[PDB]
Design a binder for this molecule. Structure first.
Ligand code: B12
Ligand SMILES: CCCC(=O)SCCNC(=O)CCNC(=O)[C@H](O)C(C)(C)COP(=O)(O)OP(=O)(O)OC[C@H]1O[C@@H](n2cnc3c(N)ncnc32)[C@H](O)[C@@H]1OP(=O)(O)O
Ligand SMILES: CCCC(=O)SCCNC(=O)CCNC(=O)[C@H](O)C(C)(C)COP(=O)(O)OP(=O)(O)OC[C@H]1O[C@@H](n2cnc3c(N)ncnc32)[C@H](O)[C@@H]1OP(=O)(O)O
Ligand SMILES: Nc1nc2c(ncn2[C@@H]2O[C@H](COP(=O)(O)OP(=O)(O)O)[C@@H](O)[C@H]2O)c(=O)[nH]1
Ligand SMILES: C[C@H]1O[C@@H](n2cnc3c(N)ncnc32)[C@H](O)[C@@H]1O
Ligand SMILES: [Mg+2]
Ligand SMILES: [Mg+2]
Lengths: 1064, 157, 233
C-alpha cells in the first residue's frame, strides 16, 4: 500500500538551473511510492513553483538548486507560500555539496521542511529520503476545503483549488455538490474538450491555443485548464506531465489543475464535478485535456460543449479512420505534427472521412473543420487557423469576445515549410554505421591479400634458395598485386620509408623525435610497431596509423604542440573584473593564453541581473556575470584576442549567438583601440573596414552553442529548439561569408550528457550523432562539407569507466572514416578535434582530498589518448567553484603529467596495447549499434521527439545512483572506506559573489541602458524584423549587442522566436 | 642476450614454416601440387626447438582458455575455476588477461617467448596467473618491547 | 634484496635496477659457493624497488622478472619457483617535496599506478606530508591504492601494459641497459670488487648530483619547486 491520503507533489529545478539529474530521480521514487507528481521541469522561478503548488493544492514541494543563490530562493518561496495561503505546504530541497550544512540549518529553521546533503543520501538511502519526505506530506487536505461556494464564486482561485481537492476525493458534502452544479448550469460557460492519441501534441497545442487567446483578447479572458494524465495503478500515484508543456498559463487569469485518471478510463471519475466547479468560479472558458485514448475511445464528448480530436499524420492505412470513434463526434480535428512526412495526404484522408461521417456531400472536403497544425512551431499559421475556427464556434455558443488582433487568415493547413533534416536522409545515422563497418570489412580483406602476397613471394625466394624454381607461385603473387587496392598498395610501399623517418633523432621543417631521460634512455615521441607480417602492417596502417595520418586514430596532428599545451582551465566568478583576475591567474607563466569562460546562471539564461531575490541571489554566482558588451570588454581586457597564441573558450548555449556577437565586437574593438594608439588617430571608414574584416578571420576561440545537447543534456535552451538551430546555422553562414576560419562555431558536446548520468557509450554515441545531425542539417541547407566541417569542435567527459580510456581515439576514427568515405570531405574535415574535461560527478563532497586522485587518473588517459584540450577539476569540486588555492592543485595535475611524468614523454603510449585496441573496437561497434537505434527512431531529431535520449540518460543515471548508495559499485570514501571521524570536508573556503559586485552589475547595467536609451527600442525592433522577414539573425546581433543588453535581446527574441518547451 | 638471439632465430623459422605451408595450401587450391614446398616446411619442423614447437602448438588451446567467462584448471584431484570477465556499467566485458590477435606465427612465438601471459615463462607480465582478490601489513615499532607489542595487539585485533 | 635506498640516494632507474639485480645475483653466487642447491634459497629471495617519475620505472618490474627468470632457468638451471621474482614497490619519497605538499598526492598516484599496471607483488604509498605520519595523512596515502584497485577502470585489466609499442620497446631498452651495467661491474671484479673501489657509491653520488643540478638549473621541471612556485609562500 502507498500513502494514507492522496499525496501530491510539485517538483522542479530552481531558477536558471539546468540541474535536473537530481530532481528527476526523485520524482521517479516519489511516483513509485504512490505519489501524484506534478513535474515542472528545470528553470522555474519561485513565482512559477508557488503558483503551481497552490493551484494543484499539493502537500509538498521538491526543489533542486545547484546554481547557488538557494538561501535567497528558498526564503522567497517560504515567504510567498505563507503570504498566499500555503503555509501548510512543506518545502523540500537538495543541492548536493552546494548547500553547506550552515545554510541547511538556516533554511530549515526559516521554514523549509528538510534539505538533504550528500551525507544524508548515504545514510538514508535514495528510497529512505523519499519515504521520509512522503511520510511528512501524508496529510488530508480536505479539511482546508471551503464549506460554502461564497469564496469560490467570488473569484478566489485558492479556494477553488481546494474545493477541487475535496470534490476529487469525494469528501465534499452532497448538498454542496448539487448546489455547485445548480450554479454551474446557470453559469453558462463553454467547455472545450481536447482529446487524442498519446503524445500527439494535446498539451502543446492547448498551450499554443491559450497563447492565441491571450494575444487576441489582450489577456481579458479567464481560462481554466483541466489536464488529465493516465495513472499507473501498480504504484498508486502518477506522473501528471501536462503542466510542464504549458508556457502560456503563467498569468492571473489562467488557472490549471492536473488530474490523474485514477483508473485503468481516460477521464477522472469526478471530472463532471471538477468542470462544474470551474464553471461556477466564473471562468470565461474551461479547457479539458484527456489522456492517451485509443481508436475506439471517446469519453470526453458528453462532458464538454466542444470537442477537439488531435492526431499525427502517422495513423497507418486510410481505412483506419473508419475505426476511430472520435472522428464521428469531434467538432474540430487537429492533425498536429504537420511537419512530419505524409502530413498533406493525412489531411486529405481525414478531411474526406469527416465529410463522410457528417454526410455533408454538398460541401467541399477542404471546408471541413479539419486543421493541419504544428504546435512545436512558434506562431504557426496552422494553429492560428484552428484558433480562428474555435473562436467562431465558441462565439456562437455564447461567449462575448472583442474583435481579434490576430491575423484573421483563411485555410485549414499550416504552411510551415521549414526542415532541419529532409525525410529522404532520415536514416543518415544508419548509413554512417554501414560506412564504418564497410571500411573494416575492407581492412580484413586487404590484410588477407597483403598477407598471402607476402607468404607467396616468401616461399618463392626460399624455393630458389634450394634450387626448385617454381614460377607457379609468382603467378598467384602477381594475381594479388591487382587484388590489392591502389591506396593499400601505396601504404605498404611507404612503410619502410615511414620507418626510417621516425627512426632518427629528427623528423625532416625539422622536429625532434627523442627525449632523453636522466638514465640516458631515448624515448621516441612516436613508437612504431615491429611487425614482420605485412598483413599486420597494413591492418595497423588502416585501423590505427601514426598520429597525423588517416584515420587519425592516435591523433589528428603529427606531433603535439611545442609551446601551447592542451591545458585550458574553466573559469568564472563574480563580475567581469574579478574573472579577468582569474584569467590572469591561470594563464600566468604561460606564453600561450588559453582561457575558458564560465558564466553565471543568469547570463546562461540570457537574463539581465535584477533586484528580485529569484535572480539577485544568483548574480555572479557559479560564473561571471556578463550583461552588456562593456562587461565582455572588461572580461578580456589585457588579452589580445587577435593574437595567434591566444584562444578563448566561452561555455554558453541558449544565448550563445548573443554572447558570441559580444565577443566578436570586443575582439574588433581591441584592434580599433590598438590602431588609435599606434597612429594617434581614429581609423578611416576604409581603414576600419579592413581592420574589422581582418579581426573576424584571425580571431581564435570556441563557442559551445550545441543546442541538440541542450534538449538532451544540459537544459540551457531558452528559445524554441527549432529557432536555436536556425540561428546556429546563421552563425555558420556568417562565418563562411567573412572567412572566420579560426573560430569554432560549435563545440558539439557530450560532457553534459555524461554528467547527467549517461555512460561513456551513450555519451560518445549521442555526441557523434548530434554532430552528424549538424552535418546533415548544413548539407541540406546548402553548404559544402569542406566549408563547415573544419569549424566543428567537440567536447567530451573523462570518468573512471574503462571505455573513457579509448573514447577520443574512437571518436577520431569514426569521424575520419565517415567524413572521407560517406561525405567525401577533405583532410581538414576528417580531423576531429575535441576538448576533454574530467568528470565532475565522479568527484564527491565526502573526503574531498580523494578527488585529486581521481582527477589525476582521468587527466592521464586524456593526455595519453592525445587530446586537443584538457580541463582539470579542483578537489573541492562538489562544494564550490575552484578557489585560488584549489585551482592551482587542479592546474598542477596537468603540469606534473606533461612535464614530470615519464611515460608522457611518449606521444602514442596507448598504441599497440592489446587492451586498448580491443576496447577501441568494442566501443566503436557499441556506438555504431546505438546509431542504428537512433536511426530507427527517426534520427536524432526523431528520437528527441520521443525523449529517447533523455529517457536513456535518466535511466542510466538511476542505475548508477542505485549502485552508488547500494555499494555494488565501490566509491572510496563514500560507500566504502569511510572516515572514523565522520566529517565531510571543517570550514572550507567558498566562491560566492560579493554584495558590491552584485550592486556593481546593476549600476553598470542601468548606466549602459541610459547610454543607448535612444537606439534601444529601434534596434530591438530591427532584430525582430530580422526573424519575421527570415533574414540572418546573427548578422543583426553583431550590431544589436552594441546598444542592447543581454536581457533586452533575449526578451525581444522571445516575442518572435518563442520559448523552449521542456521535454521531461 | 643469448636467449633473445634464440627468440629472433626461432621466430624466423616459425614464420618461414607458416609461409611455406600457407603457399602450399594456396597452390593446391589452384591445382598445382608442388610438394617441393613441403620439403622445406618439414625441414623447419626439425629446425624449431622442442619447447618452441610446443609453445605454438598450445597457442590455439591457450586462446580458448582466456576466451570464455571462466578459467577452468584442475589441480590435484579437484579444480580451480577463476573468473575472467568484469562487466562495466555500460555492459562491456573487460577481460582480465587480453591476448594478442596476431596471424603471423612468427609474432606469436616472438611474443610467447619474450612476454608470455601472466603466470608463464618468462613471467614478464607477472609471476602469477591472476591477481589475488582481497594484504595490508601492520607496521609498528616504538619505545620499549612492551609498547610495540601493545600496538601490535591493538592493530591486529 | 633492496634497491630503494640506492635510488633514494640519487641513482636513476637503470642504476637502481642494475645494482639491485647484481646484488641479488651476488647472494646467489655466494650461497652456491657454499655448496648449496639453487632451489633451496632462490624461492626465498625477495626484492624491493622504487617507483619514480622517470619513464623507465614503468617497465622496471617486468624487466626484473624477465632477467631473473631467463638467468635462473638457463644459467643456474633452477626450478619454476626460483625463476619467479617477487618484489615490493614503494613510491619514490625523493620525488615528493616540502613545497606545496598537496601536489605530492598527484605524483604518488601516478607512481602507484604504473606499479599496479606492471603487476607488482606488494605496494607502499607515500603520504602527502615533512611532518609526523599523521593518521589523516596515511589515509590519503592508503586511499590512492584503494581508488586504483577498486574504482579505476583500466585497472580491471591485469595486463594493460602488454602489447604497447612503447612498453615493449622500453622493456627491451632498459633490459639491455642493465646488462651493459652488469658488464661494467663484472670488469671491476664483480659487485664485491666494485664496492672495493666504491664504484656503486661513486656512480650513485654522481647521478644524485646531476639530478640535483638540473633541478636547480631549471632544466628539470618540478611543479611547485623550480616552476609554478607558490605566489604566497
Ligand atoms: C552533473 C552536473 C552538471 C551537469 C548537469 C546535468 C543535469 N542534467 O542535471 C552539467 C554538466 C550540464 C552541469 C552544468 C553546469 N553546472 Co554543474 N555540476 C554537476 C555535478 C558534477 C553533480 C550534480 C549532480 O547532478 N549530482 C547528482 C546528485 C544525484 O547527487 P548529489 O548532488 O550528491 O545529491 C544527493 C543529496 O543531496 C540528495 N539531493 C540532492 N538534490 C535533491 C533534491 C531533492 C528533492 C531531494 C529529496 C534530495 C536531493 O540526493 C543525492 C543522494 O546521493 C556538480 C558537482 C558535484 N559533484 O557536486 C556540478 C555543479 C553543481 N555545477 C556547477 C555549475 C557552476 C554549473 C554551470 C552553471 C557551469 C557554467 N557556468 O556554465 C553549468 C550550467 C548548468 C545549467 N544548465 O544551468 C557548480 C555549482 C557551483 C555553485 N553553485 O556554487 C558545481 C557544484 C560544480 C563546481 N564545483 O563548479 N552541471
Ligand atoms: C558548463 C558545463 C561545463 C562545460 O561545458 S566546460 C566547457 C569547456 N570547453 C572548452 O574548454 C572547449 C575548448 N576547446 C576548444 O577551444 C576547441 O575545441 C579546440 C579545437 C580544442 C581548441 O584547441 P586549439 O589549441 O585552439 O587548437 P587548434 O586546432 O585550433 O590549432 C590552431 C592551429 O594551430 C596549428 N596546430 C595546432 N596544434 C597543432 C599540432 N599539434 N601540430 C601542428 N599544428 C598544430 C594548426 O594550423 C591549427 O589550425 P588548422 O589545423 O590549420 O585549422
Ligand atoms: O600470502 P603469501 O605471500 O604468504 O602466499 C602464500 C602462497 O600463495 C601463493 N600466492 C600468493 N599470491 C598468489 C597469486 N596471486 N596467485 C597464485 N599464487 C599466489 C604464494 O606463492 C604462496 O605459495 P607457495 O608457498 O610459494 O607455494
Ligand atoms: N515534430 C513535432 N512535434 C511536436 C509538435 N507538437 C508537439 N510536438 C512534440 O510532441 C511531444 C509531446 O507533446 P505533448 O504536448 O506532450 O503531447 P500530449 O502528451 O499527447 O499532450 C513533445 O516533444 C512536443 O515537443 C509538432 O507540431 N511537430
Ligand atoms: C560541469 C562542470 O564544470 C566545472 N565548472 C563549473 N563551473 C565552474 C567554474 N566557475 N570554474 C571552474 N570549473 C567550473 C565543474 O568541474 C563542473 O563539474
Ligand atoms: Mg499531455
Ligand atoms: Mg494528457
Amino acid at each position: 500500500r502507498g500513502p494514507a491520503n492522496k499525496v501530491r507533489f510539485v517538483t522542479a529545478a530552481s531558477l536558471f538551473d539546468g540541474h535536473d539529474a537530481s530532481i528527476n530521480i526523485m520524482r521517479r521514487i516519489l511516483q513509485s511510492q504512490g505519489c501524484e507528481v506534478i513535474h515542472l521541469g528545470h528553470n522555474r522561478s519561485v513565482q512559477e513553483v508557488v503558483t503551481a503548488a497552490l493551484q494543484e493544492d499539493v502537500q509538498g514541494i521538491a526543489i533542486s538548486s545547484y546554481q547557488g543563490g538557494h538561501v535567497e530562493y528558498f526564503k522567497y518561496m517560504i515567504d510567498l507560500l505563507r503570504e498566499h495561503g500555503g503555509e501548510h505546504i512543506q518545502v523540500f530541497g537538495g543541492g548536493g555539496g552546494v548547500i553547506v550544512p550552515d545554510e541547511i540549518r538556516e533554511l530549515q529553521a526559516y521554514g523549509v521542511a528538510r534539505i538533504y546533503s550528500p551525507e544524508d543520501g548515504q545514510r538514508m538511502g535514495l528510497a529512505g529520503m523519499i519515504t521520509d519526505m512522503a511520510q511528512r506530506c501524508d496529510i488530508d487536505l480536505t479539511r482546508y476545503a471551503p464549506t460554502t461556494l461564497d469564496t469560490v464564486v467570488a473569484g478566489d482561485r485558492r479556494a477553488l483549488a481546494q474545493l477541487i481537492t475535496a470534490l476529487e476525493n469525494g469528501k465534499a458534502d452532497p448538498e454542496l455538490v448539487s448546489a455547485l452544479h445548480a450554479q454551474a448550469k446557470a453559469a453558462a460557460v463553454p467547455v472545450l474538450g481536447i482529446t487524442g492519441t498519446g503524445g500527439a501534441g494535446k498539451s502543446s497545442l492547448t498551450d499554443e491555443l491559450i497563447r492565441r487567446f491571450r494575444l487576441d483578447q489582450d489577456d481579458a479572458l479567464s481560462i481554466a485548464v483541466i489536464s488529465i494524465d493516465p495513472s499507473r495503478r501498480k504504484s498508486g500515484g502518477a506522473l501528471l506531465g501536462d503542466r510542464i508543456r504549458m508556457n502560456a498559463i503563467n498569468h492571473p487569469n489562467i488557472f490549471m489543475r492536473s488530474l490523474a485518471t485514477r483508473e485503468a478510463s481516460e477521464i477522472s471519475q469526478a471530472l463532471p464535478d471538477v468542470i462544474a466547479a470551474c464553471k461556477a468560479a466564473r471562468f470565461d472558458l474551461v479547457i479539458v485535456e484527456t489522456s492517451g485514448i485509443g481508436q475506439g475511445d471517446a469519453a470526453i464528448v458528453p462532458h464538454v460543449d466542444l470537442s477537439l480530436y488531435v492526431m499525427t499524420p502517422e495513423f497507418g492505412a486510410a481505412s483506419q479512420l473508419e475505426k476511430i470513434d472520435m472522428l464521428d463526434f469531434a467538432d474540430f480535428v487537429a492533425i498536429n505534427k504537420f511537419d512530419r512526412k505524409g502530413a498533406q495526404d493525412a489531411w486529405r484522408d481525414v478531411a474526406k472521412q469527416v465529410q463522410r461521417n457528417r454526410e455533408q456531400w454538398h460541401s467541399r472536403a477542404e471546408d471541413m473543420p479539419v486543421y493541419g497544425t504544428q504546435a512545436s512551431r512558434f506562431n504557426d499559421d496552422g494553429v492560428t487557423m484552428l484558433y480562428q475556427g474555435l473562436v467562431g464556434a465558441l462565439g456562437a455558443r455564447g461567449m462575448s469576445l472583442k474583435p481579434g488582433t490576430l491575423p484573421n487568415l483563411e485555410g485549414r493547413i499550416s504552411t510551415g515549410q521549414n526542415v532541419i533534416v529532409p525525410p529522404a536522409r532520415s536514416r543518415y545515422l544508419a548509413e554512417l554505421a554501414d560506412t564504418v563497418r564497410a571500411y573494416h570489412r575492407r581492412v580484413v580483406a586487404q590484410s588477407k591479400l597483403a598477407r598471402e602476397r607476402q607468404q607467396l613471394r616468401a616461399a618463392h625466394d626460399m624455393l630458389q634458395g634450394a634450387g626448385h624454381e617454381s614460377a607457379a607461385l609468382e603467378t598467384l603473387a602477381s594475381e594479388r598485386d591487382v587484388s590489392l587496392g591502389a591506396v593499400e598498395r601505396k601504404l605498404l610501399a611507404m612503410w619502410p620509408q615511414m620507418q626510417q623517418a621516425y627512426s632518427g633523432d629528427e623528423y625532416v621543417i625539422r622536429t625532434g623525435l627523442i627525449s632523453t631521460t636522466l638514465s640516458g634512455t631515448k624515448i621516441r615521441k612516436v613508437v612504431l610497431p615491429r611487425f614482420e607480417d605485412e598483413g599486420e602492417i597494413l591492418k595497423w596502417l588502416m585501423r590505427e596509423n601514426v598520429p597525423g595520418s588517416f584515420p587519425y586514430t592516435a591523433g589528428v596532428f603529427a606531433f603535439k604542440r611545442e609551446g601551447e599545451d592542451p591545458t585550458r582551465m574553466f573559469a568564472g566568478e563574480g563580475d567581469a573584473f574579478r574573472t579577468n583576475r582569474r584569467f590572469k591567474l591561470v594563464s600566468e607563466g604561460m606564453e600561450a593564453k588559453r582561457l575558458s569562460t564560465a558564466f553565471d546562471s543568469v547570463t546562461l539564461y540570457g537574463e539581465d541581473p535584477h533586484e528580485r531575490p529569484d535572480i539577485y541571489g544568483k548574480v555572479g554566482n557559479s560564473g561571471v556575470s556578463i550583461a552588456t558588451l562593456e562587461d565582455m570588454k572588461v572580461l578580456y581586457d589585457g588579452f589580445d584576442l587577435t593574437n595567434p597564441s591566444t584562444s578563448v573558450s566561452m561555455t554558453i548555449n541558449g544565448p550563445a549567438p548573443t554572447i558570441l556577437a559580444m565577443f566578436m565586437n570586443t575582439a574588433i574593438d581591441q584592434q580599433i583601440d590598438r590602431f588609435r594608439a599606434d597612429n594617434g588617430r581614429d581609423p578611416t571608414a576604409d581603414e576600419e573596414a579592413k581592420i574589422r574584416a581582418w579581426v573576424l578571420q584571425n580571431v581564435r576561440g570556441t563557442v559551445q552553442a550545441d543546442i541538440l545537447k541542450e534538449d538532451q543534456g544540459q537544459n540551457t535552451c531558452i528559445f524554441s529548439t527549432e529557432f536555436s538551430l536556425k540561428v546556429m546555422g546563421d552563425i555558420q553562414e556568417y562565418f563562411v561569408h567573412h572567412q572566420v576560419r579560426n573560430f569554432y562555431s560549435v563545440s558539439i558536446s557530450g560532457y553534459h550528457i555524461a554528467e547527467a548520468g549517461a555512460n561513456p557509450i551513450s555519451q560518445l554515441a549521442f555526441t557523434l550523432a548530434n554532430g552528424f545531425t549538424y552535418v546533415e542539417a548544413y548539407l541540406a541547407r546548402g553548404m559544402h562539407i569542406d566549408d563547415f566541417a573544419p569549424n566543428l569542435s567537440f567536447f567530451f567527459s573523462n570518468g573512471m569507466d574503462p571505455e573513457y580510456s579509448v573514447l577520443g581515439r574512437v571518436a577520431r576514427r569514426i569521424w575520419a572514416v565517415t567524413m572521407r568515405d560517406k561525405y567525401g570531405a577533405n583532410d581538414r574535415s576528417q580531423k576531429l578535434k575535441y576538448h576533454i574535461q574530467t568528470s565532475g560527478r565522479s568527484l564527491h563532497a565526502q573526503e574531498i582530498d580523494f578527488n585529486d586522485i581521481r582527477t589525476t587518473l582521468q587527466a592521464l588517459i586524456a593526455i595519453y589518448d592525445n587530446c586537443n584540450s584538457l580541463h582539470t577539476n579542483a578537489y573541492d569540486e562538489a562544494i564550490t567553484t575552484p578557489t585560488a588555492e584549489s585551482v592551482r592543485r587542479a592546474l598542477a595535475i596537468q603540469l606534473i603529467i606533461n612535464r614530470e611524468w615519464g611515460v608522457a614523454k611518449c606521444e602514442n603510449p596507448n598504441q599497440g596495447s592489446f587492451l586498448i585496441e580491443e576496447l577501441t573496437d568494442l566501443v566503436e561497434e557499441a556506438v555504431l549499434q546505438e546509431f542504428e537505434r537512433i536511426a530507427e527512431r527517426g534520427g536524432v531529431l526523431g528520437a528527441m521527439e520521443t525523449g529517447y535520449q533523455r529517457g536513456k540518460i535518466q535511466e542510466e543515471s538511476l542505475y548508477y545512483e542505485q549502485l552508488k548508495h547500494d555499494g555494488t559499485l565501490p566509491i572510496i570514501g563514500v560507500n566504502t572506506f569511510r572516515n572514523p571521524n565522520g566529517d565531510p570536508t571543517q570550514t572550507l573556503e567558498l566562491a560566492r559573489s560579493s554584495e558590491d559586485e552584485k550592486q556593481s552589475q546593476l549600476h553598470r547595467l542601468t548606466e549602459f541602458h541610459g547610454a543607448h536609451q535612444a537606439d534601444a527600442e529601434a534596434m530591438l525592433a530591427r532584430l525582430r524584423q530580422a526573424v519575421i522577414d527570415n533574414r540572418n539573425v546573427f548578422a543583426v546581433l553583431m550590431d544589436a549587442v552594441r546598444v542592447c543588453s543581454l536581457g533586452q535581446i533575449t526578451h525581444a527574441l522571445f516575442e518572435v522566436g518563442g520559448q523552449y518547451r521542456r521535454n521531461m | 642476450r643469448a636467449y633473445h638471439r634464440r627468440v629472433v632465430a626461432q621466430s624466423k623459422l616459425a614464420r618461414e614454416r607458416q609461409q611455406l605451408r600457407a603457399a602450399h595450401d594456396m597452390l593446391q587450391g589452384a591445382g598445382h601440387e608442388s610438394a617441393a614446398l613441403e620439403t622445406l616446411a618439414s625441414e623447419r619442423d626439425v629446425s624449431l626447438g622442442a619447447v618452441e614447437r610446443k609453445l605454438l602448438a598450445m597457442w590455439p588451446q591457450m586462446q580458448q582458455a582466456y576466451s570464455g567467462d571462466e578459467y577452468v584448471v584442475k589441480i590435484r584431484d579437484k579444480e580451480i575455476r577463476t573468473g575472467l570477465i568484469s562487466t562495466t556499467l555500460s555492459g562491456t566485458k573487460i577481460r582480465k588477461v587480453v591476448l594478442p590477435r596476431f596471424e603471423d606465427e612468427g609474432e606469436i612465438l616472438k611474443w610467447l617467448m619474450r612476454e608470455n601471459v601472466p603466470g608463464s615463462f618468462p613471467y614478464t607480465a607477472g609471476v602469477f596467473a591472476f591477481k589475488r582478490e582481497g594484504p595490508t601489513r601492520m607496521f609498528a615499532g616504538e619505545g620499549d618491547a612492551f609498547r610495540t607489542n601493545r600496538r601490535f595487539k591493538l592493530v591486529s585485533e
